Amino acid sequence: MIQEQTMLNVADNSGARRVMCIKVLGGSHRRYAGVGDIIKITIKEAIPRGKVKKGDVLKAVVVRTKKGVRRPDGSVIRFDGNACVLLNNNSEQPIGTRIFGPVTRELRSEKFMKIISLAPEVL
Amino acid sequence: SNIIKQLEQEQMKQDVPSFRPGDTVEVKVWVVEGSKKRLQAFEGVVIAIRNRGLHSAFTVRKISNGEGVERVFQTHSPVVDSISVKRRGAVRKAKLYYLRERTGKAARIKERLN
Amino acid sequence: MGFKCGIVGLPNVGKSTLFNALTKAGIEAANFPFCTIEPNTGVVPMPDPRLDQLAEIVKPQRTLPTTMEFVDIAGLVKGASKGEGLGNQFLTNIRETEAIGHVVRCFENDNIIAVSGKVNPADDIEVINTELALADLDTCERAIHRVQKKAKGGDKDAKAELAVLEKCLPQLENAGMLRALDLSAEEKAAIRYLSFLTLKPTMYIANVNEDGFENNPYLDQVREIAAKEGSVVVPVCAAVEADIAELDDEERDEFMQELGLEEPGLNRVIRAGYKLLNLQTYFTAGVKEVRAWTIPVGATAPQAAGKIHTDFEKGFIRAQTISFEDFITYKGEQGAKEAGKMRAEGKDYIVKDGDVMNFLFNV
Amino acid sequence: MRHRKSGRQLNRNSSHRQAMFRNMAGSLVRHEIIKTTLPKAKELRRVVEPLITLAKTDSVANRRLAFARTRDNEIVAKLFNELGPRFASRAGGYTRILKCGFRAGDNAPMAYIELVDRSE
RNA sequence: CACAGGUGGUCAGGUAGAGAAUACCAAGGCGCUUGAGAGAACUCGGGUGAAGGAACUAGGCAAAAUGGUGCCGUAACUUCGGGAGAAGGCACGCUGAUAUGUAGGUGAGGUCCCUCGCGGAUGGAGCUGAAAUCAGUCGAAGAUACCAGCUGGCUGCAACU
RNA sequence: AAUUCCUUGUCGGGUAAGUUCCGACCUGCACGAAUGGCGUAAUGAUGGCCAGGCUGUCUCCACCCGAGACUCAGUGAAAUU
RNA sequence: GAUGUCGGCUCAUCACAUCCUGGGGCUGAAGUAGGUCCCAAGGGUAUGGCUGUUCGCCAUUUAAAGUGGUACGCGAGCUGG
RNA sequence: GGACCGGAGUGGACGCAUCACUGGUGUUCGGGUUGUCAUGCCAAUGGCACUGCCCGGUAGCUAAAUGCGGAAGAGAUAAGU
Ligand SMILES: [Mg+2]
Ligand SMILES: [Mg+2]
Ligand SMILES: [Mg+2]
Ligand SMILES: [Mg+2]
Ligand SMILES: [Mg+2]
Ligand SMILES: [Mg+2]
Ligand SMILES: [Mg+2]
Ligand SMILES: [Mg+2]
Ligand SMILES: [Mg+2]
Ligand SMILES: [Mg+2]
Ligand SMILES: [Mg+2]
Ligand SMILES: [Mg+2]
Ligand SMILES: [Mg+2]
Ligand SMILES: [Mg+2]
Ligand SMILES: [Mg+2]
Ligand SMILES: [Mg+2]
Ligand SMILES: [Mg+2]
Ligand SMILES: [Mg+2]
Ligand SMILES: [Mg+2]
Ligand SMILES: [Mg+2]
Ligand SMILES: [Mg+2]
Ligand SMILES: [Mg+2]
Ligand SMILES: [Mg+2]
Ligand SMILES: [Mg+2]
Ligand SMILES: [Mg+2]
């Protein structure tokens, strides 16, 4: 349940530490992004020497939320903290080369095979 | 109600082990990767149990790869293949939500030998 | 002092043969002082073709490549972390070095027996890492116990160490491999002194058959693992490496051209170890000698001066830096100099890969 | 909405309601019949009758619960030494509401609530 | 107006507390001169709130928050006082031991003197009594309630009160 | 600029985005030296701006507790017309 | 002998000179994407930074961010910049 | 670079319902706890301190929860053919 102004920890090694959601993409008046949803972000905190820079505007895919995901059986998977993986604006592809922390099955689709393959643990 | 009792009972899993909040449990869940079912183990502390017959649930909390992860399992869902208690913890409280604030040393709980 | 990648695994993984093919191709101690080669310390020549190129261009009387040491760590038993002697020998063996190469078998052989009966590298890696993580959790518990008393004394450094350790402890209690954690450079610095076995950069040497360099479900499993923790791989054959180290240049080229290999796989292995430890190579070029030396990426000019002589480090004045490609294009030190492609670098400089310089000191 | 909810607010905050019904339960126990308002009597059923049920078994713990609920040791004594035995075989329904009309001062609907065996 | 306002002085119990604060009580005094129900919207006065966290708005208005003591620590700048409680960090309950109640306060007998008194020494019985350390112990939480600073940066104006 | 019309001046900072803010510039419509100029620590229920924390301020409201509103009994208005 | 103002909020409602979606003619319409005109009002038709602003610039969305009337709709509904 | 036509999925916004799930609430349930008063005292309890402060939480209500919807068709047409 990521919305505009929601700060996300970053789950890759792109060099961003804290990003902010500035748009929930994919719909007029769309309110929230869950996991597997692309958002537009501004990088609010970056490591000094990283592939991305503070104040950069780009995309991210939400991979962990505190709401979490429901599963078809009715079960839910909540995470501590909201995290996203940075993506290129045009290619939609991840910018880092490492994924840190678990991701979910909801992220498993043609578009995010890289994040699934790189993740330590897919839930 | 009696009708719904029957429908829910006809469906309730029969092998659910005894476990209490604070117990470290390992839950085997079925993962359907494409076509094939494997078992994925989720091992963590039971921080909450909902006792509702067929709608019984329990929350398991563990730190995966640096981040706390809670899975609320539906006890009788057939996706939960098995539950096994690995460590009986000693908490005197039904819901261990205070563990969400605990880190490391203060998040572990006394082993229950009772 | 050098750079080390200890060769580890379960029993019967193909490590002794790997270290043997290493030492057969390596250089004995009669060609490099300061290096008393132990039977578990095998120093081998580092492959830098830029060294051959510079030695062609300048034609020195002698040639010295940089040489890097392997430490073959053998002997592991289930329950190696419960205090037993051979497991503790394993621990003390691996702890001294800094880079770690795990050996995986990714081949099916009726005349070689596996570790659990079914040939599956996932099982191999999980058992080895559960061992290393039990040892590591032991270490981290001791450290966190040693620290929290100090951090309750209000010390800031102790609190930062405490935060890192308590964010690392649930990783180790779950048999997880602590390099998968997103630990910052400051945190890496904070806990470098605990010398954890589970963050040391680890490569994956994949002993595979001759006909299976591609399309290998065991190699595929190793690939997915090495991605899942950001590790690298060198799929090789121990038999092919023994053939490589046991022949002359003519027969080595013959066996390479028959099997389609262009350089020995040991070159690729030691190059994986080279890039594993943030290493890079510079050269000294001259008529007397051309020698390769190796520095960490990020290294200073003063430490590069020191890596030969201490006085060079301490009395440094200026270094005259020319790249390997700049040596290449203009045919020698004089040729690249006459273009002005020396650069004057002081005590704030960082030496890169390929640069050749002539140090100036006054002590 | 108040779908399925129980318990009359009776235009009091909760602790006033609890105090009032404690007092009213004590009044009913010691006098065995009291005039109050019909809604108040209907709610008083839900407090008194469990006290009598509790008093059907005379342990120290049960006298302690009764005392917590009544805060009157004379009421607890009469509950366990008289009322419990007087209702030992009666399966609930220890009170009787008898509507008795309308209070003059505010036209309030009034009832008598008594112990069922108040005749004997 | 039998009006939620205003009106000087005197008294000043207990437990906790620094306290005339505050909480709960005493003596004392009251339940405020319409009640009874119900448990819609809406309003007013509160409580809680998933995920988010100023996106609200003219404006963080309101709310939420901070909040005690001790110790450590404390920047720019300064008129050298300040700034400053800057900021920030740690500890905190209970029980036992030290010590059948300590440091300290009080000080009765008894002993000696005495310009025999409401004296001075000595002496410590009794009473009172922190603070600290160590060890143990309960809880999710020990300044547990009430009470009780939000903090920092840039800047206009006016020295200030 | 408590002063600047043009004007959201220009450039820079800060923000993803800054008519406000801060710094500089100076093309001062229309500053200027006791109807003082310029600085200035401290101070302020003073004006403006930024950040941390904090949050139902908001997304986007939900529930609950009480006082009314509602029903009954008693009493008994008002503006307006 | 009083018809309360701008903007915001809340709630709208109509028109159609249509922003999107629907149908079509022409095209300097290969396709994709457009331009233009005709039909068409069923439904839909941003969030933010700045500023009291509407507006506008800007950031980032959207199929689209339509244009007007309604006392420049709406203060016995709110606000009061 | 790249389609019409036709087909399948899956979303956004919106709407209706519902509470099985996931949750909020839950001053009517249980517990913990500080101060204090009281129940003769101990023990145990109760009152008050915002429900004293909190931790959970049943039913209900409920959204963020999860079901369903917009249609297809058929007449008569618009522009047009
Ligand atoms: Mg009433
Ligand atoms: Mg009166
Ligand atoms: Mg008065
Ligand atoms: Mg007072
Ligand atoms: Mg909330
Ligand atoms: Mg929350
Ligand atoms: Mg705003
Ligand atoms: Mg706004
Ligand atoms: Mg305020
Ligand atoms: Mg100004
Ligand atoms: Mg003044
Ligand atoms: Mg200025
Ligand atoms: Mg702002
Ligand atoms: Mg600007
Ligand atoms: Mg003037
Ligand atoms: Mg003059
Ligand atoms: Mg003058
Ligand atoms: Mg003043
Ligand atoms: Mg009325
Ligand atoms: Mg009436
Ligand atoms: Mg038209
Ligand atoms: Mg108007
Ligand atoms: Mg208005
Ligand atoms: Mg009006
Ligand atoms: Mg005004």
From Swiss-Prot, chain A:
Gene Ontology BP terms: cytoplasmic translation
Keywords assigned: Ribonucleoprotein, Ribosomal protein, RNA-binding, rRNA-binding
Matching InterPro entries: Ribosomal_uL14, Ribosomal_uL14_bac-type, Ribosomal_uL14_CS, Ribosomal_uL14_sf
GO terms, molecular function: large ribosomal subunit rRNA binding; structural constituent of ribosome
Pfam families, sorted: Ribosomal_L14
Record flagged with keyword RNA-binding: yes
GO cellular component, one term: cytoplasm
Matches recorded under PROSITE patterns: RIBOSOMAL_L14 (PS00049)
Function: Binds to 23S rRNA. Forms part of two intersubunit bridges in the 70S ribosome. In the 3.5 A resolved structures L14 and L19 interact and together make contact with the 16S rRNA in bridges B5 and B8.
Family that this chain belongs to: Belongs to the universal ribosomal protein uL14 family.
Subunit structure: Part of the 50S ribosomal subunit. Forms a cluster with proteins L3 and L19. Forms two bridges to the 30S subunit in the 70S ribosome, contacting the 16S rRNA. In pre-50S ribosomal subunits interacts with RsfS, which may inhibit association with the 30S subunit.
Official protein name in the record: Large ribosomal subunit protein uL14
Organism: Escherichia coli (strain K12)
From Swiss-Prot, chain B:
Signal sequence extent: none
Keyword Ribosomal protein appears in the UniProt entry: yes
Alphabetical list of Pfam families matching this protein: Ribosomal_L19
GO cellular component labels: cytoplasm; cytosol; cytosolic large ribosomal subunit
GO biological process, one term: cytoplasmic translation
UniProt keyword terms in alphabetical order: Ribonucleoprotein, Ribosomal protein, RNA-binding, rRNA-binding
Claim: Translocase is one of the keywords in the record: no
GO molecular function, one term: structural constituent of ribosome
InterPro entries: Ribosomal_bL19, Ribosomal_bL19_CS, Ribosomal_bL19_sf, Translation_prot_SH3-like_sf
Entry's induction text: Part of the rpsP-rimM-trmD-rplS operon.
Subunit structure: Part of the 50S ribosomal subunit. Contacts L14. Forms two bridges to the 30S subunit in the 70S ribosome, contacting the 16S rRNA. In pre-50S ribosomal subunits interacts with RsfS, which may inhibit association with the 30S subunit.
Family affiliation: Belongs to the bacterial ribosomal protein bL19 family.
Stated name of the protein: Large ribosomal subunit protein bL19
Organism: Escherichia coli (strain K12)
Gene: rplS
UniProtKB/Swiss-Prot annotation, chain C:
Effect on the protein of changing K78R: Retains K(+)-dependent stimulation of ATPase activity and differentiates between K(+) and Na(+)
Gene coding for it: ychF
Activity regulation details: ATPase activity is stimulated by potassium and other monovalent cations. Stimulation is maximal in the presence of K(+), followed by NH(4)(+), Rb(+), Na(+) and Cs(+).
UniProt-recorded Gene Ontology molecular function terms: ATP binding; ATP hydrolysis activity; enzyme inhibitor activity; GTP binding; metal ion binding; protein homodimerization activity; ribosomal large subunit binding; ribosome binding
Species the sequence originates in: Escherichia coli (strain K12)
Needed cofactors: Mg(2+)
Protein name as it appears in the record: Ribosome-binding ATPase YchF
Protein role: ATPase that binds to both the 70S ribosome and the 50S ribosomal subunit in a nucleotide-independent manner. Does not hydrolyze GTP.
Family according to the record: Belongs to the TRAFAC class OBG-HflX-like GTPase superfamily. OBG GTPase family. YchF/OLA1 subfamily.
HAMAP family assigned: YchF_OLA1_ATPase (MF_00944)
Database matches in Gene3D superfamilies: 3.10.20.30, P-loop containing nucleotide triphosphate hydrolases (3.40.50.300), TGS-like domain (1.10.150.300)
UniProtKB/Swiss-Prot annotation, chain D:
Biological process annotations from GO: cytoplasmic translation; ribosomal large subunit assembly
Superkingdom, taxonomy of origin: Bacteria
GO MF, one example: structural constituent of ribosome
InterPro entries hit by this protein: Ribosomal_bL17, Ribosomal_bL17_CS, Ribosomal_bL17_sf
Swiss-Prot/TrEMBL keywords: Ribonucleoprotein, Ribosomal protein
Gene Ontology terms: cellular component: cytoplasm; cytosol; cytosolic large ribosomal subunit
PANTHER family: LARGE RIBOSOMAL SUBUNIT PROTEIN BL17M (PTHR14413:SF16), RIBOSOMAL PROTEIN L17 (PTHR14413)
Protein family per UniProt: Belongs to the bacterial ribosomal protein bL17 family.
HAMAP family membership: Ribosomal_bL17
Subunit structure comment from the entry: Part of the 50S ribosomal subunit. Contacts protein L32.
Function text: Requires L15 for assembly into the 50S subunit.
Listed name of the protein: Large ribosomal subunit protein bL17
